[PDB]
Amino acid sequence: LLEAGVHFGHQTRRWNPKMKRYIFTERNGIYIIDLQKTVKKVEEAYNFTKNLAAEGGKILFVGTKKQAQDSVKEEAQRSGMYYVNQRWLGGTLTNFETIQKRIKRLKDIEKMQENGTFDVLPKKEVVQLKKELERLEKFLGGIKDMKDLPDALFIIDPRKERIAVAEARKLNIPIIGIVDTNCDPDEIDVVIPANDDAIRAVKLLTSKMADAILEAKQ
Amino acid sequence: RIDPSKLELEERLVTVNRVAKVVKGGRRFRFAALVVVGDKNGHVGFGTGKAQEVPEAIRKAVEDAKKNLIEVPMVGTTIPHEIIGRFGAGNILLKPASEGTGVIAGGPVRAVLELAGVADILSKSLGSNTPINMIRATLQGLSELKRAEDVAKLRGKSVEELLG
RNA sequence: GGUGGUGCAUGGUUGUCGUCAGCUCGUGUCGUGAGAUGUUGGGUUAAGUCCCGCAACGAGCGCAACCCUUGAUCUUAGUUG
RNA sequence: UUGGGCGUAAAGGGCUCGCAGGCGGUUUCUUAAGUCUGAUGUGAAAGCCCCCGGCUCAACCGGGGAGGGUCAUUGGAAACUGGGGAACUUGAGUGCAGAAGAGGAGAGUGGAAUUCCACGUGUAGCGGUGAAAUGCGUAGAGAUGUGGAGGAACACCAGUGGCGAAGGCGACUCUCUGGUCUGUAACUGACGCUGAGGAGCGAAAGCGUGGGGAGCGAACAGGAUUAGAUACCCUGGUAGUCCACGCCGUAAACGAUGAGUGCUAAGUGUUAGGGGGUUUCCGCCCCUUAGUGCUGCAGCUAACGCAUUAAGCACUCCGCCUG
């Protein structure tokens, strides 16, 4: 059922025959994702994530495309969840201890610039401290209040970004994600076939999941 | 699944290898380690050990041991059937026997089977005499084991029908 | 007691590559393992200087800096000047 | 054998045609050589082994039993294998209709270019190197113009492009001749695969007899180079290469991968087809046989790598290896 869909969406010949049972064929080379199978698989994801919100795995969001930098951040801040619109760091989950040390450095340096000893030099902060502040507010972003190992993750393109999925797979964590047709269904537990770069659809699919956990707050 | 760390690990070592690296000045001698880790109730695992010292390699062996454990069926303190593992040029076969037969195994392999609790194994190191791959020759075969009630559930059949 | 012997028993002490831009560690992975990544790629610098990229994020010893001298000026102090 | 290998570690015969030997599609009847099984006869005793008893226990000795036979006779079993009888057509082959080709052998044909020689024109050098000399030159070289002999090589097309089993074959045309692939269905009814010895082919070198020898060129010679230069360089230079015929029968004769049959994600070009979809088209798209390459999943691998052209998983045959 076309709830608000507009797309069939994406890849030509560079497509995985693991996802053979999912698409149709157009003469244009771009393939047509079956819309009825799309709604049925995301609805069980819409069901189980509400159970996941009742337990304590908050939600993780990661988006590493220029279309993904905006829609993922606004939906995560609508939910108060954890967004990555920048690069992914090698070891955000298994290497959590040096992540928590580094985010501790950001946690108290903001105390220095407004409450702490702000008057040391007029340029010690500029060369070192505020240059640190521009980095970590981007590269460590709004996932900063995590203090936990989460039990879920949402991404946009694992074929672009297998690197983030690896340690999440390696600690037995069921994750969700919109996938491209060339992606890995052996990897992900929750398959969502849709257009990877439709700016409305990536806003649409992140709207349903953020409103899934929004209703699950009671 | 992943075996949890809510167990009683016994963790006695097997070998230590001093392992070099050649720089502008000269060599650099470090140490290698590998420790078979488990209880005596069916959970076996290990990890590598790399450091610049003896005892810190013993420490860091326990980490990947608790990251990677695996479970073995213990039917009558035996392996339930016969199997031959073949990981990486070290072949080590596994044969069950009666309960008086003890643990007849190779050097590093004998420090694996007693860290399963399983006390009835005949085995024979067909392949090479290298300590990492012989332990890889064991658990890969022990991964491919099966349980009596499980395969009857796989076949949709009676468990006693597998015996009679 | 030895300015008797061995600096291929030694402490200690300095030269030397060279004041050269390097040497590793912690965690994470990578590879059956040795090791690899971090340190490599891009742009610069006296410099592993520093930025960007980057399955790595970090930290430590180094570089520089805080130390002296000389180069300007003010305060205070003017004799044996 | 249970209980290895063969890309590079020791190992695929250079490749073929094949007698013997090896192995067999499908359906059905039948037979019982293999196979399965009973019964009987027998494999002495001591010894091993099952269990008792005896010696002060033990060792030893004794009692009883089992076991040991590709054993023979006899009677059963008929799925599979062997044998016989009869059918089916996918394997393989034949017809027919196409298409591709540097496949072979033969006699002949040219076109640039090298040199040689004849001559005009024309003067001091060209020739050659890291540098330079030897060689060539006032007897007229080199350069240049026409003409002549003669050989061998066949640009451009040229391309992980064609074809052959391999070595190999590129000017052109003719004569003669091999296989290849598609299209089905007309036919045969398993006629097939592999193959020790045996047979034939097999670049270059070399050999024997004559032919022919323009370049090129081992041996040698000369000039340098160098402490030495029996070498790289240098100008010449014999055999050779070349042809017909005969022989040697080896090579990194390489995909460092023995031949065949099936099966196991893709994506991608590219050579020859064929089928279709709108279209006479051109074309695009899709399906599909065949070699031809690259990047890739599972799995295999000691790692590099290999991956529907396997080194994946299986099977039949032949060779080879055991530091």
Swiss-Prot record, chain A:
GO terms for cellular component: cytosolic small ribosomal subunit. SUPFAM superfamilies: Ribosomal protein S2. One of its GO terms (biological process) is translation. Part of the 30S ribosomal subunit. Interacts with BrxC. This is Small ribosomal subunit protein uS2. HAMAP family: Ribosomal_uS2_B. Pfam families: Ribosomal_S2. Belongs to the universal ribosomal protein uS2 family. The keyword Oxidoreductase does not apply. InterPro entries: Ribosomal_uS2, Ribosomal_uS2_bac/mit/plastid, Ribosomal_uS2_CS, Ribosomal_uS2_flav_dom_sf. Keywords: Ribonucleoprotein, Ribosomal protein. Gene3D superfamilies: Glucose-6-phosphate isomerase like protein, domain 1, Helix hairpin bin. It comes from Bacillus subtilis (strain 168). GO terms for molecular function: structural constituent of ribosome. NCBIfam families: rpsB_bact.
Curated annotation (Swiss-Prot), chain B:
The keyword Repeat does not apply. This is Small ribosomal subunit protein uS5. It comes from Bacillus subtilis (strain 168). Disulfide bonds: none annotated. The gene is rpsE. Belongs to the universal ribosomal protein uS5 family. GO terms for molecular function: rRNA binding; structural constituent of ribosome. Changing residue 110 to H: In rpsE7; suppresses S12 mutant K55D. A ram mutation. GO terms for cellular component: cytosolic small ribosomal subunit. GO terms for biological process: response to antibiotic; translation. Part of the 30S ribosomal subunit. Contacts proteins S4 and S8. Coiled coil: none annotated. Residues 9-72 form the S5 DRBM domain. With S4 and S12 plays an important role in translational accuracy; many suppressors of streptomycin-dependent mutants of protein S12 are found in this protein, some but not all of which decrease translational accuracy (ram, ribosomal ambiguity mutations). PANTHER family: MITOCHONDRIAL RIBOSOMAL PROTEIN S5. Keywords: Antibiotic resistance, Ribonucleoprotein, Ribosomal protein, RNA-binding, rRNA-binding.
